[PDB]
Design a protein around this motif. Structure first.
Motif, PDB file in Angstrom:
ATOM      1  N   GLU A  31       0.826  -1.199   0.000  1.00 28.41           N
ATOM      2  CA  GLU A  31       0.000   0.000   0.000  1.00 28.41           C
ATOM      3  C   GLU A  31       0.863   1.253   0.000  1.00 28.41           C
ATOM      4  OE1 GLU A  31      -2.444  -0.807   3.499  1.00 28.41           O
ATOM      5  OE2 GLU A  31      -2.209  -2.892   2.852  1.00 28.41           O
ATOM      6  N   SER A  32       1.905   1.267   0.828  1.00 23.87           N
ATOM      7  CA  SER A  32       2.798   2.418   0.878  1.00 23.87           C
ATOM      8  C   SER A  32       3.511   2.611  -0.453  1.00 23.87           C
ATOM      9  CB  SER A  32       3.804   2.239   2.011  1.00 23.87           C
ATOM     10  OG  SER A  32       4.897   1.443   1.596  1.00 23.87           O
ATOM     11  N   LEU A  33       3.990   1.520  -1.045  1.00 25.26           N
ATOM     12  CA  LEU A  33       4.668   1.605  -2.331  1.00 25.26           C
ATOM     13  C   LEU A  33       3.721   2.093  -3.414  1.00 25.26           C
ATOM     14  CD1 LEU A  33       7.146   1.062  -4.126  1.00 25.26           C
ATOM     15  CD2 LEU A  33       6.360  -1.301  -4.321  1.00 25.26           C
ATOM     16  N   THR A  35       1.119   4.003  -2.954  1.00 24.87           N
ATOM     17  CA  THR A  35       0.905   5.423  -2.716  1.00 24.87           C
ATOM     18  C   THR A  35       2.072   6.242  -3.243  1.00 24.87           C
ATOM     19  OG1 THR A  35       1.654   4.892  -0.485  1.00 24.87           O
ATOM     20  CG2 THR A  35      -0.703   5.279  -0.816  1.00 24.87           C
ATOM     21  N   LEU A  36       3.296   5.781  -2.995  1.00 26.77           N
ATOM     22  CA  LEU A  36       4.466   6.505  -3.476  1.00 26.77           C
ATOM     23  C   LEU A  36       4.483   6.566  -4.995  1.00 26.77           C
ATOM     24  CD1 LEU A  36       7.279   5.295  -1.071  1.00 26.77           C
ATOM     25  CD2 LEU A  36       6.137   7.510  -1.181  1.00 26.77           C
ATOM     26  N   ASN A  37       4.377   5.407  -5.639  1.00 25.79           N
ATOM     27  CA  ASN A  37       4.488   5.308  -7.085  1.00 25.79           C
ATOM     28  C   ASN A  37       3.263   5.834  -7.816  1.00 25.79           C
ATOM     29  OD1 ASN A  37       2.402   3.385  -7.389  1.00 25.79           O
ATOM     30  ND2 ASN A  37       3.803   1.680  -6.993  1.00 25.79           N
ATOM     31  N   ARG A  38       2.176   6.118  -7.104  1.00 27.89           N
ATOM     32  CA  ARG A  38       1.014   6.773  -7.683  1.00 27.89           C
ATOM     33  C   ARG A  38       1.113   8.282  -7.513  1.00 27.89           C
ATOM     34  NH1 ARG A  38      -3.560   4.843  -8.624  1.00 27.89           N
ATOM     35  NH2 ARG A  38      -3.584   3.107  -7.130  1.00 27.89           N
ATOM     36  N   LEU A  39       1.163   8.738  -6.263  1.00 28.68           N
ATOM     37  CA  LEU A  39       1.147  10.166  -5.986  1.00 28.68           C
ATOM     38  C   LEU A  39       2.460  10.817  -6.384  1.00 28.68           C
ATOM     39  CD1 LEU A  39      -0.398   9.770  -2.448  1.00 28.68           C
ATOM     40  CD2 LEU A  39      -1.636  10.428  -4.520  1.00 28.68           C
ATOM     41  N   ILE A  40       3.576  10.174  -6.065  1.00 31.57           N
ATOM     42  CA  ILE A  40       4.883  10.797  -6.232  1.00 31.57           C
ATOM     43  C   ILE A  40       5.870   9.818  -6.856  1.00 31.57           C
ATOM     44  CG2 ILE A  40       4.553  12.540  -4.466  1.00 31.57           C
ATOM     45  CD1 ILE A  40       5.802  10.696  -2.447  1.00 31.57           C
ATOM     46  N   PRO A  41       5.544   9.215  -8.002  1.00 33.79           N
ATOM     47  CA  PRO A  41       6.571   8.495  -8.775  1.00 33.79           C
ATOM     48  C   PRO A  41       7.460   9.504  -9.495  1.00 33.79           C
ATOM     49  CG  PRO A  41       4.498   8.454  -9.940  1.00 33.79           C
ATOM     50  CD  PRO A  41       4.214   9.090  -8.616  1.00 33.79           C
ATOM     51  N   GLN A  42       8.420  10.051  -8.752  1.00 34.22           N
ATOM     52  CA  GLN A  42       9.306  11.100  -9.246  1.00 34.22           C
ATOM     53  C   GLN A  42       8.549  12.381  -9.579  1.00 34.22           C
ATOM     54  OE1 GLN A  42       9.797   7.706  -9.890  1.00 34.22           O
ATOM     55  NE2 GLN A  42      11.255   8.096  -8.227  1.00 34.22           N
ATOM     56  N   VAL A  43       7.317  12.519  -9.085  1.00 31.15           N
ATOM     57  CA  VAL A  43       6.670  13.821  -9.106  1.00 31.15           C
ATOM     58  C   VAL A  43       7.451  14.800  -8.250  1.00 31.15           C
ATOM     59  CG1 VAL A  43       4.563  15.099  -8.585  1.00 31.15           C
ATOM     60  CG2 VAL A  43       4.417  12.774  -9.516  1.00 31.15           C
ATOM     61  N   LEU A  46       9.658  16.453 -10.595  1.00 29.78           N
ATOM     62  CA  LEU A  46       8.908  17.508 -11.263  1.00 29.78           C
ATOM     63  C   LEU A  46       8.830  18.740 -10.375  1.00 29.78           C
ATOM     64  CD1 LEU A  46       5.994  15.196 -12.463  1.00 29.78           C
ATOM     65  CD2 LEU A  46       8.090  15.736 -13.707  1.00 29.78           C
TER      66      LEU A  46
END
Lengths: 50, 49, 50, 49
Positions: A31-33, A35-43, A46
């Protein structure tokens, strides 16, 4: 054989404990991964801390 | 939510590590299932014995 | 029991094949999802086709 | 690579679809292996017998 059965039950308990613990923990990790790779996958890149 | 301030400056390594831990999820769950069912078969054998 | 061995081997072959294909295609789809949320995790909004 | 143009203009929804696919991956494999795995145990048992 009854002692074997007792130990086998103990082993069933141990396997169940391990499988639970690990599946739950790694489910929260998933779940944490996600969330990271959805909300902030290298966002963040950006955002770049500009 | 996870950590409290958790290397937000650069977290890709953490994403990779968590990918490794999900691989661990798969391996561990399959291993537990196989072992427990095999030893259940053993339990059955012991019962019949 | 050797006839059972033969039938069991047939079943194993079938399941092995199915699992291999299924995991390959679903892994490819997972990789596609990762490419989406890695190259374009709503990065298209920054691109915005301006 | 997957799809040919496949509504790339606004592809958000597809990701959610893939999530389901991703889920169906685990299931689709977790069962599969287990099945063969099961018979493997049985195969061993048969051999032993």
């Amino acid at each position: 054989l009854r002692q074997r059965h007792t130990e086998l039950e103990r082993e069933v308990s141990r396997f169940e404990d391990q499988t639970q613990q690990q599946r739950q923990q790694y489910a929260q990790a998933k779940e944490s991964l996600t969330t990271l790779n959805r909300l902030i996958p290298q966002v963040t890149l950006l955002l770049d801390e500009t | 939510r996870q950590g409290r301030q958790y290397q937000a400056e650069d977290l890709e390594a953490l994403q990779n590590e968590l990918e490794a831990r999900q691989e661990a999820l798969s391996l561990s769950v399959n291993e537990g299932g196989e072992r427990r069912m095999e030893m259940r078969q053993e339990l059955e054998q012991l019962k019949q014995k």
